[PDB]
Design a binder for this molecule. Structure first.
Ligand SMILES: *[C@@H]1O[C@H](CO)[C@@H](O)[C@H](O)[C@H]1NC(C)=O
Lengths: 49, 33
């Protein structure tokens, strides 16, 4: 009935203040000399390096 | 700019050192010593 089982429940906003900092390089490693369509979220990288 | 007196001259540019994404009510800039 009362054994310690603690919970932390969460909530996100309905945008009371926009986002702060956005996603990191959830990425694989580098590539070379073979055209690869890749994405930097602002630099859609498509062509050889 | 190596100067001595009364030469408000010099031509250059600026980089954003900080962008605090606050977006707050801003028209007052009391600059104090
Ligand atoms: C101050 O900032 C808030 C942030 O949402 C904005 O809604 C409000 O209009 C601003 N006040 C003025 C006087 O611009």
């Amino acid at each position: 009935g009362y054994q310690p089982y603690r919970v932390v429940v969460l909530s996100f906003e309905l945008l009371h203040a926009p986002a702060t900092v956005c996603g990191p390089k959830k990425s694989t490693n580098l590539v070379k000399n073979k055209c690869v369509n890749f994405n930097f979220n602002g630099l859609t990288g498509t062509g050889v390096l | 700019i190596n100067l001595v007196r009364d030469l408000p001259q010099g031509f250059s540019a600026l980089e954003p050192l900080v962008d605090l994404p606050i977006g707050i009510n801003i028209t007052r800039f009391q600059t104090l010593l």
